[model samples]
Target: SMPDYVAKYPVIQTDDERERYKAVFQDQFSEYKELSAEVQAVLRKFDELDAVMSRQEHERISRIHEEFKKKKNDPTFLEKKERCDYLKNKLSHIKQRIQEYDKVM
Candidate 1:
């Protein structure tokens, strides 16, 4: 479990291919670590924005719906609806990407 959580691995096994096998595994992880960091930063940005964006959107959409309910002929209703739909779609994009990077890591 600890090995699954942190960096740094051990080569405690006694065998001739141990060093070479360790080298290959280490190589795999070096690239993985770098890529994981880059992907994590992207995920952090997505999460940071998602935290505020969804709440702000919720409020704005509620206001728009309230306005539209009062005035059935409001033109901005569709625009607000479209904006909300755009965010709803991209939420999946970012959400899926986060999970994808996590699986890779």
Candidate 2:
């Protein structure tokens, strides 16, 4: 359940505290949104590639898979993968990020 704004951002809480919490939540939401966008873009690219590869387009497949492998190990890849898992629950890093976010939040 979502926390009530009034309760979560207490009326008596200092402006700084309120802003800090708001920033934290905003950051989380922003990160989720950005990661979602990235995953969608990748999925779209994958779909396009899939169509092109349907006839055993070996050259294209090899090129795209190489790029995919490069992305798979990049630092941002882990973050993006974690976000994908959060939204889909099929990523291996999902649990790790869930625990991390739970602790942070």
Top-TM-score candidate index: 2
lDDT of 1 at 58: 83
lDDT of 1 by residue, 1-105 (tens): 112211232322344434544454555455545555554554465445436426998899777656535543345544444444443444334344444444655
lDDT of 2 by residue, 1-105 (tens): 223343333332354554565555555666667788877777676667657546567777788888866765677766777655554432223334344444655
Model 1 ranges with Cα > 4 A deviation: 1-14, 54-105
By TM-score, how accurate is candidate 2? 0.41
lDDT, each prediction: 0.46, 0.56
Per-model TM-score versus the true fold: 0.37, 0.41
- Provide the lDDT at 52 for model 2: 56
RMSD each, Å: 16.6, 10.7
lDDT score, candidate 2, position 26: 57
